[PDB]
């Protein structure tokens, strides 16, 4: 497949996981039969699913990139804040709303300060930075620029390293997925090398310690994903206890990556009619918790990896704004990748 199929697939896959996963957000347990019914209802017998904050912020990030043809912290912060002001009921978390209201003050002449000040100066470690980050890996082909701008774009709302590191992980995952076919072992080793480095910085260690976490939450979960991929059967309870299904970035980003790697292979519980990308989204949603956001992040990776040949027209056409999403993906490819 061509890179353009991957760009289009990446943003469609993210759009799908948000649209489809929104119905189940903050549900502790999800019935898999309910999820199969929900997705099957997208291919009925001869209204759109609305997207949430994940997509709204992913759109803004992409649009900022395209408008300035580069990362531009001021532009992007203003587009996040204005998108919120215009449509605040898309399902934003309460934490990030506080940052938007501050970014909205005309005295605000440092757009990183609201995020940096949050939680008594420790910053948010939620996955709102990672939920939106995929486009950075479509704008920036080098791994050094992916980590740099994933970090920066995250820090506009999520200043804890526990937050921005999740964003970097997610973007790296997307980056690597664009290189296409990989063993799950090679994909992880690559991610691991970057995170073990990043989690050694002082701020990373200090932020973990402060949370009492015996540290390297990302590296230790990447190591666990490999362990889980080698096990005959792994239950949802096991995934949830080991990796997580929560709003904290370290409880969702590794989990997203697991859903992507695990769903390369057939699942007896998911009908054989569904392809790898569809299985990925079904399975991620089926874990419960932060279903929209885990599924949007698994969807970005899967979409980049498998490309449009696995994005079902029936499902894509069910999502709000799919044609606009597709135009922005084409535009990213034209502007950043072509030359």
5 binds, among Cl ion, Mg ion, none (CB under 5 to 8 A by kind): Cl ion
Whether 242 and 225 have beta carbons less than 8 Å apart is answered as no
Contact with Mg ion (CB under 5 A) among 137, 245, 293, 316: 293
Question: 167-206 mask for Cl ion (x: CB under 5 A)?
Answer: ----------------------------------xxx---
Among positions 4-43, residues that touch Cl ion (CB under 5 A) are 4-5
Contact with Mg ion (CB under 5 A) among 49, 54, 240, 244: 54
Instruction: Using alpha carbons, select from 264, 315, 325, 256 the residue that is nearest to residue 291.
Output: 256
Q: What is the spatial distance between Cα 130 and Cα 18, in angstroms, rounded to a whole number?
A: 13
Q: Residue 327 in 3-state DSSP?
A: helix
| Residue length of the chain | 339
3-state SS of the chain: helix, strand, coil percent to 5?
A: 65, 0, 30
Q: Least CB distance from residue 155 to Mg ion, whole Å?
A: 20
Per CB under 5 A, which region of 9-17, 47-55, 280-288, 305-313 contacts Mg ion? 47-55
292 binds Mg ion (CB under 5 A): yes
Distances (CA, A) of 205 to 25, 119, 200, 216, 299: 31, 18, 6, 8, 30
Among positions 76-135, residues that touch Mg ion (CB under 5 A) are 91
Question: What counts of helices (H) and strands (E) characterise the chain?
Answer: 19, 0
Task: Please give the structure tokens belonging to residue 81.
Answer: 């804040």
53 binds Mg ion (CB under 5 A): yes
338 binds Cl ion (CB under 5 A): no
Q: Least CB distance from residue 115 to Mg ion, whole Å?
A: 18
Contact footprint for Mg ion (CB under 5 A): 52-54, 91, 290, 292-293
Contact footprint for Cl ion (CB under 5 A): 4-5, 201-203
């Amino acid at each position: 497949m061509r890179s353009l199929s991957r760009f289009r697939g990446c943003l469609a896959g993210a759009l799908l996981g948000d649209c489809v996963g929104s119905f189940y957000e903050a549900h502790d347990t999800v019935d898999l039969t309910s999820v199969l019914r929900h997705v099957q209802s997208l291919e009925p017998d001869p209204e759109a699913l609305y997207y949430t904050d994940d997509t709204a912020m992913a759109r803004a990030l992409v649009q900022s990139l395209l408008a300035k043809e580069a990362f531009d912290e001021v532009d992007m912060a203003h587009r996040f804040a204005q998108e919120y002001k215009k449509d605040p009921d898309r399902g934003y978390g309460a934490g990030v709303v506080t940052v938007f209201k501050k970014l909205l003050n005309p005295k605000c002449r440092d757009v990183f300060e609201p995020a940096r000040a949050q939680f008594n100066g420790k910053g948010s470690y939620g996955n709102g930075g990672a939920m939106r980050v995929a486009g950075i890996s479509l704008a920036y082909s080098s791994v050094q620029d992916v980590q740099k701008f994933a970090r920066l774009s995250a820090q506009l709302t999520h200043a804890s390293s526990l937050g921005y590191n999740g964003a970097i992980l997610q973007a790296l995952a997307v980056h690597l997925a664009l290189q296409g076919e990989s063993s799950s072992e090679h994909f992880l080793k690559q991610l691991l090398g970057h995170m073990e480095d990043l989690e050694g910085d002082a701020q990373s260690v200090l932020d973990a310690r402060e949370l009492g976490m015996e540290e390297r939450p990302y590296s230790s979960r990447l190591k666990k994903i490999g362990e889980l991929l080698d096990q005959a059967s792994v239950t949802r309870e096991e995934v949830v206890s080991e990796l997580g299904n929560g709003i904290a970035a370290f409880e969702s980003v590794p989990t997203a990556i697991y859903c992507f790697l695990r769903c390369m292979e057939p699942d007896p519980e998911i009908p054989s009619a569904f392809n790898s990308l569809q299985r990925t989204l079904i399975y991620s949603i089926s874990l419960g918790g932060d279903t929209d956001t885990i599924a949007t992040m698994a969807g970005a990776i899967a979409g980049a990896y498998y490309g449009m040949d696995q994005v079902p027209e029936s499902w894509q056409q069910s999502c709000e704004g799919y044609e606009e999403t597709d135009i922005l993906a084409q535009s990213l490819h034209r502007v950043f990748q072509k030359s």
